[PDB]
C-alpha cells in the first residue's frame, strides 16, 4: 500500500501539465517527491505498486488524480496509463461513507473553536486535516502572500499555473494528511475489522475483509466518475430555440401585466427607525428612515448656498419607483391585496404565502385583475424553465462542453440515506415529460445527439427504471409481519395503477406521490393537498390504505423499539434518547436516522439506494463480461443515473436491447444477493432521447 497525491495546472476538464507528485510507501515508511521531469518515474512507481498486487490511496483520486494522470500521461508522455479500479482507494469516498454525518458532528468542532467555518461539513483535504490536526497552512495562502509582496494581483487559481518548491512542499503535506485520514478511517471497527492491518494487506484482502459498503462505495464512485467524463449528449440548438420562444412569451406576459399593473412608489433603503419627533419614541409602524448627519441651507465661511438635497437632522423616507415584477412575491401580494384578496395563510417571518396553491385559488372582483393572476402563473413557470435552461448560473446552456455534452456532477453518497446528489447542473431535477415544456427539455438530452466517431450515425438510448422500488423494500421489511402477503400482492398488476384506482386519483403520478406521502407519515391535511381535497379525505385515504396492510403499523412500531428509548418535546424540538441512532444498511453500513418520524423513510430510502447502487454496478459489470466496452469509442456509455433509473447510450439498437435485458438480470441478481423477500423488477425503453425513454 502507498499513499499519493498529485498537483496539476488545471481541473480535469482543462489540465495540460503535470506539476508534481508524492508517494508514501508503507513498506519503506518513506516519502518520495516527483518534480515535473519525474512524471514518467512517478507513473512507474504507481504501476509498480499495481504489479505487486498492492493498493494506491488518493483523496478524490477516483474523480481527479486517476483520470488526470491518464489524460496527462497520454498528452505529455504518449503512454496509456490506467490504474485498475480494484487497486485504488479513495479517502473521500471512505470519508463520505463512514462520516456521512458531518453537518451535525461538526458543530462542536466549531463551537469549541477548531475548524475554520468555511470548512463546515466539508470532506475536503483541508477540512479533514484541520479536524485531524495536521494543518500547517494552505498553499494558496502562501502564494497569495508572495504575490502581495511583489505587488501583483491574484487571479482565481493562478497558484497552479506553474510549479515551484512551495507547491511541492504543500504536496507532501497533502500526502501526510491523506495518510492521517486513511488511518483514522481504518480505525473504525464497524467498517474495518481490528484483527487486520488494512495498511499491510493486498487489494483482494482489503475488499474481502472490509465491510461490503466500502467495496460498493468505491465501485459506485469509479463508475459514476466514468459517467461524468462521458457526459449526456445535449441538443444545444433545440434549447436555444426554446429559449427564444420562452423569452418572447415572457416579454408578452410582462407587457400585458405592466399594462394592467402600473408603477408605484415604495420604500427602499431605510435602515434607521422613524421615531416620534417630540418624544423621541420609535414608531415601527412607519417604514425605515434615513436622517442625514450633514447638510444645511448654506455652506461654511453672502455665504454661498448648499445645493445638496438634504439637511442635517431632517429625516426622510428613501423610496423607489417600481414597475410591476411578476417574479417578486411582494409585488404580487401587494397588488392582489389592493384588488381585494384577503390572505389566509402566512409565513413564520411575517409575509403572506404567494405560491401556486394560493394563486390558483385567489379570487378578486375586477375581471382584469383575476385574469392577470393567470398571466402571473404562466410567467412564473416560464421563468422557471428559462432560469433552469438558459439564464441561471448553472443553466444547461452554460454547461455544454466542446463535445456537445453536459457533464453533470454526482456525489455518490451525498444523501444521509445513501442516495447520491446531483449538481452543476442537477440532472435529477429536469422537468418531467408530463410537465409544461418537459418533453422538449427531456428530448434535448439524448444519445441521438451524439454521432458515432466511425460511422457518424446517431447513437440509440436505453432507459431502465426500477419498478416500485421503495414499495418493494417495504414489502421486504414487513414480510416478517405479514408472512410475505404484501410482497406477493404487489406484483398483481402495477401497484401504482392499482392504488390510483383504489384511491380514485386522476393520474398514476398522483398515486405515486400519494402512496409515498402516506407511507412516510403525511398528515391528514397533507394527504388532502396531495390528492386535491381536505383533511376529511386525508383521514379516509389514510385509514383505507392503513387498514388494508396493517403490517405497516407493526413495522413502524418495531423501528421505534429498535431506535428510540424515550422522548420529550421542549419548544419546537424533540429531545430523543437513542438506543441506537442508526439503521443497518443492506450492505452493513450505518445509516444515520435524523428523526424518529422519518425512520421508516430512512429504512426504505436507504435500502432502495443501496439496491440501486449495486444494480448500476452489476449491470455494467455484466455488460463488460459480455464483451461490451464502456465509452463513446466502444459499445455503451452511462449517461445518467437518477436514483433508480439509468440512461445508457448505445452505439446500436442491438446493444441497447442487450443493455435493457442485462439491467433486468442485474436487478434480479441484486435481489438474490441480499436475500430480498420481495421480487425486484425493472422496466426498459429504447429510444432516441430521455423524453421517449420514460
Amino acid at each position: 500500500m502507498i499513499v499519493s497525491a498529485i498537483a496539476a495546472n488545471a481541473l480535469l476538464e482543462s489540465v495540460t501539465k503535470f506539476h508534481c507528485g508524492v508517494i508514501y510507501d508503507y513498506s519503506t515508511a518513506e516519502y518520495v517527491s516527483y518534480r515535473p521531469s519525474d512524471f514518467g518515474a512517478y507513473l512507474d512507481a504507481l504501476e509498480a505498486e499495481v504489479a505487486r498486487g498492492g493498493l494506491i490511496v488518493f483523496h478524490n483520486g477516483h474523480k481527479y488524480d486517476v483520470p488526470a494522470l491518464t489524460k496527462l500521461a497520454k498528452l505529455q508522455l504518449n503512454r496509456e496509463f490506467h490504474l485498475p479500479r480494484e487497486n485504488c482507494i479513495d479517502t473521500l469516498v471512505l470519508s463520505r461513507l463512514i462520516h456521512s454525518n458531518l453537518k451535525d458532528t461538526d458543530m462542536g468542532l466549531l463551537r469549541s473553536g477548531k475548524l475554520p467555518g468555511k470548512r463546515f461539513g466539508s470532506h475536503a483535504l483541508e477540512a479533514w486535516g484541520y479536524r485531524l490536526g495536521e494543518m500547517k497552512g494552505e498553499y494558496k495562502d502562501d502564494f497569495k502572500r508572495m504575490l502581495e509582496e511583489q505587488g501583483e494581483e491574484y487571479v482565481d487559481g493562478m497558484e497552479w499555473w506553474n510549479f515551484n518548491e512551495e507547491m511541492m512542499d504543500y504536496n507532501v503535506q497533502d500526502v501526510v494528511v491523506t495518510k492521517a485520514l486513511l488511518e483514522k478511517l481504518l480505525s473504525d471497527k464497524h467498517y474495518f475489522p481490528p484483527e487486520i492491518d488494512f495498511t499491510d494487506v493486498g487489494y483482494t484482502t482489503f475488499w474481502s475483509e472490509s465491510l461490503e459498503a466500502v467495496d460498493i462505495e468505491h465501485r459506485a464512485a469509479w463508475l459514476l466518475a466514468k459517467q461524468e467524463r462521458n457526459g449526456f449528449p445535449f441538443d444545444t440548438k433545440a434549447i436555444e430555440e426554446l429559449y427564444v420562444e420562452l423569452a418572447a412569451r415572457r416579454s408578452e406576459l410582462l407587457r400585458k401585466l405592466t399594462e394592467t399593473f402600473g408603477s408605484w412608489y415604495q420604500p427602499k433603503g431605510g435602515t434607521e427607525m422613524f421615531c416620534h419627533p417630540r418624544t423621541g419614541k420609535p414608531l415601527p409602524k412607519y417604514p425605515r428612515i434615513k436622517t442625514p448627519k450633514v447638510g444645511g441651507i448654506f455652506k461654511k465661511p453672502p455665504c454661498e448656498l448648499d445645493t445638496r438635497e438634504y439637511v442635517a437632522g431632517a429625516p426622510y423616507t428613501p423610496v423607489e419607483h417600481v414597475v410591476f415584477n411578476p417574479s417578486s412575491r411582494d409585488h404580487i401580494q401587494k397588488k392582489l391585496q389592493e384588488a381585494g384578496w384577503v390572505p389566509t395563510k402566512y409565513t413564520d417571518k411575517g409575509a403572506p404565502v404567494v405560491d401556486d396553491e394560493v394563486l390558483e385559488g385567489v379570487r378578486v372582483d375586477d375581471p382584469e385583475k383575476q385574469a392577470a393572476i393567470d398571466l402571473i402563473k404562466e410567467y412564473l413557470m416560464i421563468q422557471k424553465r428559462i432560469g433552469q435552461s438558459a439564464e441561471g448560473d448553472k443553466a444547461w446552456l452554460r454547461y455544454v462542453a466542446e463535445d456537445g455534452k453536459i457533464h453533470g456532477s454526482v456525489n455518490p453518497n451525498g444523501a444521509v440515506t445513501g442516495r447520491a446528489t446531483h449538481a452543476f447542473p442537477n440532472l435529477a431535477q429536469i422537468p418531467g415529460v408530463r410537465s409544461p415544456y418537459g418533453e422538449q427539455c427531456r428530448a434535448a438530452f439524448g444519445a441521438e445527439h451524439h454521432l458515432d466517431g466511425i460511422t457518424g450515425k446517431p447513437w440509440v438510448q436505453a432507459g431502465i427504471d426500477a419498478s416500485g422500488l421503495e414499495l418493494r423494500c417495504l414489502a421486504h421489511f414487513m414480510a416478517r409481519f405479514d408472512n410475505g402477503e404484501y410482497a406477493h400482492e404487489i406484483l398483481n398488476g402495477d401497484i401504482h395503477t392499482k392504488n390510483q384506482i383504489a384511491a380514485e386519483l386522476p393520474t398514476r403520478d398522483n398515486a405515486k406521490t400519494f402512496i409515498y406521502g402516506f407511507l412516510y407519515g403525511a398528515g391528514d391535511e397533507k394527504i388532502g393537498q396531495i390528492v386535491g381535497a381536505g383533511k376529511e379525505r386525508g383521514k379516509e385515504l389514510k385509514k383505507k390504505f392503513l387498514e388494508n396492510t396493517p403490517a405497516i403499523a407493526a413495522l413502524r412500531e418495531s423501528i421505534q423499539q429498535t431506535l428510540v428509548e424515550s422522548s420529550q418535546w421542549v419548544a419546537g424540538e424533540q429531545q430523543v434518547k437513542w438506543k441506537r441512532r442508526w439503521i443497518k444498511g443492506l450492505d452493513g453500513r450505518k445509516v444515520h436516522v435524523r428523526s424518529p418520524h422519518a425512520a421508516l423513510n430512512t429504512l426504505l430510502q436507504s435500502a432502495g439506494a443501496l439496491i440501486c447502487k449495486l444494480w448500476i454496478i452489476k449491470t455494467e459489470e455484466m455488460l463488460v463480461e459480455k464483451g461490451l466496452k464502456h465509452g463513446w469509442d466502444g459499445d455503451f456509455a452511462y449517461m445518467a443515473w437518477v436514483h433508480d433509473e439509468i440512461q445508457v447510450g448505445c452505439r446500436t439498437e442491438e446493444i441497447a436491447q442487450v443493455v435493457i435485458e442485462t439491467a433486468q438480470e442485474a436487478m434480479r441478481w441484486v435481489g438474490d444477493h441480499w436475500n430480498f423477500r420481495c421480487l425486484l423488477d425493472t422496466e426498459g425503453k429504447m429510444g432516441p432521447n430521455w423524453a421517449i425513454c420514460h
Binding site: 421489511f477 416478517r480 423501528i559 429498535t562 439503521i583 443497518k584 429504512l603
Partner: peptide, 4 residues
C-alpha cells in the same frame, strides 16, 4: 428478530 431484527433486520436493521
Amino acid at each position: 428478530d431484527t433486520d436493521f
